[PDB]
Every structure is written in C-alpha cells, then in structure tokens.
Design brief:
Two copies of one chain form a homodimer.
Chain A lengths: L1 E5 H11 L14 E7 L2 E7 L3 E8 L4 E2 L1 E6 H10 L5 E7 L2 E6 L2 E6 L16 E5 L1 H9 L16 E16 L3 E21 H9 L8 E5 L3 E6 L2 E6 L8 H4 L6 E6 H12 L8 E7 L2 E7 L5 E7 L7 E6 H11 L3 E6 L6 E5 L5 E5 L3
Antiparallel strand pairs in A: 1-5, 1-7, 2-3, 2-6, 3-4, 4-15, 7-8, 8-9, 10-13, 11-12, 12-23, 13-14, 14-15, 16-21, 17-18, 17-20, 18-19, 21-22, 22-23
Helix pairs in contact in A: 1-2, 6-7
The complex binds ligand 2VM (2 copies), calcium ion (4 copies) and chloride ion.
PDB class: transferase/transferase inhibitor
Keywords: DnaN, transferase
Assembly: dimeric
C-alpha cells in the first residue's frame, strides 16, 4: 500500500471517520483507522462495532493498492499538525506505516487490516433523499427530549418515522416529548425505527451545511446515511417506542400566545428560586396576562408578570421550568403558542407561526 | 437597608466580587455576598477567609443605611437575567431581602451581616502603581511554570519581586523556571513576596484592560490591589522562594535562533510519538540545522529537521517536550533564541528581540 495525498484532502475525511472512537474500545484494534487503497481510491474507516464511518478519497497521485490500520488519534494529529499545503506520503513498511512530508518523518505502529472488524452487509427496506437542512431541523427540534439513561434504554434515542410524504422525529423521556415532521416530496412506506443517541450525534455531525443532499437507507436493524463522499452506518435500538399520537392532549382548547424571548427570560429568572431538584414553577393564566411564580425550601420566592394574548378561562398549573426552558430554547422564534386544558393535563407548545414541531410537557 | 441602582452600575461590581467565590463554600455564609449601605455608598464583599473582594458603588437614588448578606450566585443571576436598563430596587424585610424590577419580584434569604467574617486590618509596607497591561504581561509570562499542589507549598505560588524601578515575577516547579521583569518608573525598595495560586488567578481576573491604573500595597502577610472602585486582597505564602539568579545558565556559549512558530510546530509534531509519561525528545544541533527526534516504547518514531540560525560546536541534548512547548506558547513572538551550554546543562530560552522574559528548562 502506498499513497501521497495533499493534507487538506485528507484532513476532513480523517476528522469525520475519527470520532467516535469514544475512549473505550472493546478491542484494541478499534482504536485504529482502517486504510484501504483500491482502484484509485483511499477508503478510511472507523468503527465501534455498532456504528461505522467510511470516507473515500480519490487518489490523483501515484499509489499502490493494499490495506493496514494505524492509531487514529496519532495519525490524525500528525496530519493536522503538518503545515498548510503539505503533501503527505504514506507507505506500509513491514509492521510500520511510514508517513513523510517535507523533512518531517513518522513511523506509526500498525495492526493487520485482515484483523479489523468488517460489519456484515445488510439490505435496505426503505430509502429516501432529503436536504441536509431538513435532517438538521428534524434532529435539533427533538434531540433535547431524549432520555439520558443507559446506552441501551429504548428512550435514549430518537424515533425516525416515515409516513406518506413526511419524515418525522420523536423524542421523549416519559415526562416531556418533542415531535417534528417535515415533508420530503416522495411517498414513503409506513416505517419507524429508533436510532441510538450516539447515532443521532453522528447524523448531525456529518451535516456540513452545503450543496450535498443526504441519502438515507433503513433496514431491519440498521440505518445508513450518505453525504458527499462519506457513509455513516448505525445499529438501531430494539424496543417498542411510544405513540406520540397518544400523548398529545386531546382538546387543548385554551390558547395563549406570547413573545418567545420575553417568556423565556421570565421563566429563566423565576427558575433561580425554584427547587434545585424538582424545578417546579407555577403559571397563573388570566385575560391577556401570565404570572409565573417559583419558590424553594429556603422560602425564597420569585414572581414574574407578562402581558400575553389570552382570552379563555383562568387556570393555575405547575411545570418543571427546565423542561419549559428546553422547549423555548429549541424554538428560537418570535412568538410561542401554549395550548392548555386544565391543571392536571399536559401542555402543548408550538411556534405560533408553524405546526411542524410540537412539544408536550406534563404538569407537576 | 435600602437602595435602588441601575443594572448596568451593579453588574460589573457583582461579577468582580462574586465571580471568584465558586461552588463549595467552606462555611455556609461564605456563599453569600455582604451588602453594606453607608455614607452614600453600596459596598459588596465576597471572601473565602483568605482572599477578599470589595467593590463600592455610589448611590445617587434614595437609600437607607444598613447591612445584610444574600446568596451571591442567586443575586448575581437575578441581576444579570433582568433586562438592560432595569432599575433594581432592594429593601430588607425581616430575614428576607426583597429585589424588585419592573414586574419582576424576588425574595432572597439572608444571613446577618454581623456574622460575616471581617478580615483583620493590616499595615502596608511597600506600595507602587503600574499599568494593568504590565501586570497582565508579568503574570502570563510566568504563570504556567508554577508548581501544581507540590508539597513544597512555596512553589505553588508566584514570586513578586521589586528591584530598582522594576517589578519582577518568578515561577518554578523544580524542573523549569520562568522569570519576567518590567520597568514601572518608581524607585522601589528591594523586596519579594509569594502570592498563592488562587491570588494570582484573581489578580489576573480583576484586570479589564481599561485606563484605570493598578495600585498595589504589600504588607508582611498580605497583598492588596486596587483598580477603580474594586479592591482585591490575598494572603501571602509564608516561605522561602528559590533565587532565579542561581538557576540561569552562567555561561551559555551556544546560541541558536529560530522561527518560534516553526520550532513549536516541529516540537508539537514530534511530541505525538514521544513517551507518554516522560515526553523526552532529543535535539541535534549543527550548522544552521536542528534535528528533533522522538520515540516511544512501541518503537514509533518521529523526526523533524529545521533550518535555524546556528554556528558553533555540534551537540545533542534531551528535553521534556511539554516544558519546551509551554515556553514557546508563552513567548508569542516571531523568533526565539535558545542558549545552550552542553548536554548536561539547562537551556535558557528567550524572545530573540527581547530580554524581558527568560525561561530555564533542565535537560533529560
Ligand atoms: O406513565 C407515564 C405515561 N407516559 C409515557 C410517556 C409519556 C410521555 C409524556 Br410527554 C407524558 C406521559 C408519558 C412516554 C413513555 C411511555 C412508556 O411507558 O413507554 C409512558 N409516564 C410516567 C413517566 C415515565 C414512564 C416511563 C419511563 C420513564 C418515565 C409517569 O409520569 O409516571
Ligand atoms: O536540584 C535542584 C532542584 N531544583 C529546585 C529548583 C529548581 C529549578 C529548576 Br529550573 C531546576 C531544578 C530545580 C527550584 C526549587 C528548589 C527547591 O526545591 O526549593 C529546587 N536545584
Ligand atoms: Ca462491511
Ligand atoms: Ca408534527
Ligand atoms: Ca476587614
Ligand atoms: Ca528578566
Ligand atoms: Cl421577561
């Protein structure tokens, strides 16, 4: 194996395939990247046995086919630490990989490519394409509502659901829920799968924000995303994800509209004097007015009064202010609509201007 | 006690005094700020029993004298979360402190001011003033060479030495040393004190890069710095500091000059394949050339060759790369000079264009 590649053609591929690579490999060789030269292309692979990231780099300079594996972090750091414009010449030399550029030289240890885990081929059952912006919107709208449990917990991940012409994400921890649906202009079979937290992070991380659209393939137990010259594959989480349709409040007839930024600032101040563990605040809704109160075991008290648009019946309701703040911070919009029923029912929150995301928060 | 002040006249003082407090107060009241109204002034004080931070704010609006203490972070967080231009109206009501602005209202718990630890008055023995930029330079030049939690408690601080018309800092951990001297235009008595790590951090933090000069007063067991209407006081470390004049190479015959960034990047690359515990690299110096090599126990090897300015006998010498890189990162200059004697002697490193900072690193 031999190749020479200009540094800035190697750097982004290395960064995308390296990470993670999350500190605790279950086999030593998983701390290495797999390098493969074949048919004019250098392929770079990183994996933790569950997810896999593969980058392909076209080789325009002289090269020789073959494969090896080298420590990912060290190889990345050597390439990154070389100056702008550096040509990076690599050759396999026995049990070492030699890296040369200018008058810099590095001999890295290798482990055989034949020993690197090769994840089984699988068959896609659903495929679609979408703009990167749409995927980014879907994830950012819901990601914060996933449970923070052990890795295999069924709610520690994001439901991805295809239905008609839309892709939908759902995330929940059993107390609050986020759901976002976006049309993608292709009619799709009914299907839903759970992508683990770590998979969700990589789907986001692979979005550069450019011309390149995203191509997604979903199988029985895996999902695959292609963008430009990169392919990411993740295992799915086994589990029965809850039905968001059953958690939306049936008749959230009482509608309050407020400026998102003023509402957020008011909740943020009140939160300071809320119970540090339970984070409870009380909302008092009345005609064109919202009153937010908080108190804590030290008998400290906060009160905020805001003008809002509201003309239904008065009511009082308790919420976890962190959950409410998470929603307002995810919305990043001018006005918010809070859709209320009564003191013992959940609230549904939406950008006043768009129903494409909804958030459900249970009262305390 | 009552006062009303604009948010923008309260925020900086609160940040100055409360910023240093951090989590884990050693006694509950040390989590509180002391507020005192007297003679048309609000004073705000935070302490950990050894250092103390006091800011004075002039009260132009109606006020009433008195004192209380309130949780520092909560009061600061409330003041910061209020909008720009908020009038902040404060009133003591029993064992609670009332804070009101617009339609935001808060009630904080108090602890009596009479119970707030008052640090003893002490007498100034050496006084001088200097620009903030100068103090910043002196600390940044040397801070990284301070020991970290060494049993030789005296090495965990920074020496401040007055000699002639210069203020000097020195820091060393027993393996490397940094010294910086700057003229300040006053005839100073010859004197030196050790400021503890936490005191150095606050000295740096209180700098704002405005026109306000820094006024320093040194006592037998304390130091005070005034900038504008802010006063920081720290205990000194009672111990005997090394004499930097004994550590500087007496006769470093071999001078090597090099681009700082080039040298730094070469060392940084070679460091990747240095022993992870001992971080040894070797330098081979010859006519206008420096070769750097690193190897580790897995038989990985790096080599870097640089064009540098050097005429003199050829020599080899080993260094901890981290110590060399710390210096090169501290210098922030175009060219560096390394002053060498032989393989068993320390090296002195300086900016090639200024002798105001010097660094000594022992060979391996
Ligand atoms: O029983 C339920 C009903 N439930 C449930 C979910 C949920 C989401 C929202 Br926004 C409101 C109510 C929801 C989503 C998780 C559902 C499940 O059992 O898989 C149960 N919730 C538990 C919370 C909980 C259930 C399972 C796991 C964690 C927390 C409770 O409030 O006692
Ligand atoms: O043998 C020594 C150890 N030592 C010591 C210091 C020092 C500084 C440098 Br750059 C190199 C070695 C140093 C300064 C700290 C001295 C002490 O232990 O009090 C000892 N003298
Ligand atoms: Ca495979
Ligand atoms: Ca929706
Ligand atoms: Ca005092
Ligand atoms: Ca000096
Ligand atoms: Cl507000």
């Amino acid at each position: 194996m031999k190749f020479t590649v200009e540094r800035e053609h190697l750097l982004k591929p290395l960064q995308q395939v390296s990470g993670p690579l999350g500190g605790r490999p279950t086999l030593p060789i998983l701390g290495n990247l797999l390098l493969q030269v074949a048919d004019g292309t250098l392929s770079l692979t990183g994996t933790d046995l569950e997810m896999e990231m593969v980058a392909r780099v076209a080789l325009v300079q002289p090269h020789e086919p073959g494969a090896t594996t080298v420590p990912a972090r060290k190889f990345f750091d050597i390439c990154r630490g070389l100056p702008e414009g550096a040509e990076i010449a690599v050759q396999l030399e026995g049990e070492r990989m030699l890296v040369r550029s200018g008058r810099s030289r590095f001999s890295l240890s290798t482990l055989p490519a034949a020993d690197f885990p090769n994840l089984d081929d699988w068959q896609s059952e659903v495929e679609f394409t979408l703009p990167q912006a749409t995927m980014k919107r879907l994830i950012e709208a819901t990601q914060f509502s996933m449970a923070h449990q052990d890795v295999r917990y069924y709610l520690n991940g994001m439901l991805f659901e295809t239905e008609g012409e839309e892709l939908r994400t759902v995330a929940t921890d059993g107390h609050r829920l986020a759901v976002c649906s976006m049309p993608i202009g292709q009619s799709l079979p009914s299907h839903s799968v759970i992508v683990p937290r770590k998979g969700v992070i990589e789907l986001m991380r692979m979005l550069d924000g450019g011309d390149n659209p995203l191509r997604v393939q979903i199988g029985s137990n895996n999902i695959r995303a292609h963008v430009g010259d990169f392919i990411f594959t993740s295992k799915l989480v086994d589990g029965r994800f809850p039905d968001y349709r059953r958690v939306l409040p049936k008749n959230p007839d009482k509608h309050l509209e407020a400026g998102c930024d003023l509402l957020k600032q008011a909740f943020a101040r009140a939160a300071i004097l809320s119970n540090e563990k339970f984070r409870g605040v009380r909302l008092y809704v009345s005609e064109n007015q919202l009153k937010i109160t908080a108190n804590n075991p030290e008998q400290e008290e906060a009160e905020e009064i805001l003008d809002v648009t509201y003309s239904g019946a008065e009511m009082e309701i308790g919420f976890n202010v962190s959950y409410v703040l998470d929603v307002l911070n995810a919305l990043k919009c001018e006005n918010v609509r809070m859709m209320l029923t009564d003191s013992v029912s959940s609230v549904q929150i939406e950008d006043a201007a768009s129903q494409s995301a909804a958030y459900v928060v249970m009262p305390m």
